[PDB]
Amino acid sequence: PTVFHKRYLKKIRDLGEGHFGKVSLYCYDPTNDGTGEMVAVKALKADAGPQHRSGWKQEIDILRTLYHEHIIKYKGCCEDAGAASLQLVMEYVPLGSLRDYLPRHSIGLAQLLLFAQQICEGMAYLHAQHYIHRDLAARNVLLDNDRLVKIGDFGLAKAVPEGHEYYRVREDGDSPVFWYAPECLKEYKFYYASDVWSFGVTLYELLTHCDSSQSPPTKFLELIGIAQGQMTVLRLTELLERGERLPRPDKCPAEVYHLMKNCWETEASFRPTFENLIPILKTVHEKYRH
Ligand SMILES: Nc1ncnc2c1ncn2[C@@H]1O[C@H](COP(=O)(O)OP(=O)(O)O)[C@@H](O)[C@H]1O
Ligand SMILES: [Mg+2]
Ligand SMILES: [Mg+2]
């Protein structure tokens, strides 16, 4: 509901880009003294078409209705006269995403399992609100402090109508295919269980400290090959249907890899829900903590 006046917004730096969104760091200082809050402002590029504009409206509408300790905090909106739409104002998390933080900070196993438990808590809340995230990846998991994680980026999020188990989307170039379950790839159907598959991929990213050489696109493309014409998604669907999976990260405990593999069941109903994962991850974190 809050309205931020463009008048008092001072750009500090960009945090994320590019086609078709941009996240920037601003100081919102109405007193003009410097005591003003630091905010992360997400803007829709003025060049964006109707499809991305109706989607952006949905992203703001969804984030506005969500309230959870593991979901990025919505602060309000700013009128972007130049766009012309709304700029999404949210809390700024200094440590950034796990994708940017982990390659530079060796975090212990216990802490990574805590982040994974918190991701499941935030996701179970999201699923109880009858929404699917559709872009669950380490790049979209923001770190508030060494012990606290927050899910962001609701750009692909959708409301799943009551009584329905899935939502159908179309063939898109920006689809994060390397984080997607086979039902999404082959039938274009996104179930609550499809987000669980993406969590298994996110859990794999965390256990690899988001190392680029071990990332899901890197590993799947080494399996698929780069001279496949328009067939990368087809070869991906085929390798997953044959039971091939991302490997066990170095130092990942066997039980944790088995949990990962269970999130990667080909049959969507054989996967645990986020509600089932919470006590499991609480127990595993407790085992590994010291
Ligand atoms: N609240 C925030 N605080 C700090 N960095 C953020 C915040 N929101 C986003 N970012 C950074 O900007 C990147 C892009 O933001 P995101 O919402 O995921 O946009 P996109 O839809 O283009 O992927 C994130 O991966 C992260 O690096
Ligand atoms: Mg993102
Ligand atoms: Mg996004």
Q: Which residues contact 224 (CB under 8 A, 6 or more apart)?
A: 232, 235, 236, 239
User: Which atom number of ligand 1 is nearest to the Cα of residue 42?
Assistant: 17
| Cα–Cα distance, 99 to 216 (Å, whole number) | 12
Tokens encoding 9? 């917004």
* Whether the Cβ atoms of residue 28 and residue 36 lie closer than 8 Å to each other: yes
Q: Give the torsion sign (CA, 171, 175, 177, 183).
A: negative
Give 38: exposed, middle or buried? Use CB within 10 Å, 0-12, 13-18, 19+: middle
Residue 82 CB neighbours (<10 A): 10
List the catalytic residue out of 47, 61, 135, 144.
135
**Ligand approaching nearest to the C-alpha of 25:** 1
Find out whether the beta carbon of 203 lies less than 6 Å from any atom of ligand 1.
Answer: no
Known catalytic membership, residue 47: no
For the CA of 94, the closest atom of ligand 1 is 4
State how far the Cα of 224 lies from the Cα of 239, in Å rounded to an integer. Answer: 8
| Ligand 1 proximity of 15 Cβ (cutoff 6 Å) | yes
* 24 ligand 1 Cβ < 6 A: no
Known binding-site positions: 15-23, 42
CB within 8 Å of 159: residues ≥ 6 apart: 62, 130, 131, 167
Measured in Å, residue 121 CA sits from the centre of ligand 1 at 20
CA 180 from centre of chain: 12
Domain with CATH 1.10.510.10 in the chain: 93-290
**CA nearest 64: which of 129, 109, 142, 10?**
129
Task: Report which residue type is found at 155.
Answer: G
Hey, how many other C-beta atoms are within 10 angstroms of the C-beta on 194? 24
Ligand 3 centre distance from Cα of residue 13 (Å):
19
Q: How far apart are CA 268 and CA 206, in angstroms?
A: 23
Residues whose CB is less than 8 angstroms from the CB of residue 179 and which lie 6 or more positions away in sequence, other chains included: 135, 136, 137, 197, 198, 201, 202, 216
Dist. CA 77–CA 60, nearest whole Å: 9
- Before 18, cis peptide (omega within 30)? yes
Task: Give bridge partners of residue 4 from the DSSP assignment.
Answer: 78
Q: Are 214 and 208 in contact (CB under 8 A)?
A: yes
Residue with token string 């905090």: 73
Where exactly does CATH 3.30.200.20 map onto the chain?
1-92
Nearest residue CA, atom 1 of ligand 1? 92
Q: Helical H runs in 66-144?
A: 98-101, 109-128
Best residue among 39, 92, 97 to mutate for probing ligand 1, ranked by most atoms within 8 Å of CB: 97
Q: Is 96 in the pocket of ligand 1 (CB under 6 A)?
A: yes
CA-wise closest residue to 177 among 226, 243, 240: 240
CATH tag, 1-92: 3.30.200.20
Q: What's the token pair of residue 67? A: 């309230």
Could you count the other beta carbons within 10 Å of the beta carbon of residue 159? 15
Any bridge partners for residue 167, and if so which? 190
Determination technique used: X-ray
Instruction: Give the homologous superfamily in CATH for domain 93-290.
Output: Transferase(Phosphotransferase) domain 1 (1.10.510.10)
**If you take atom 13 of ligand 1, which residue's CA is the nearest one?**
16
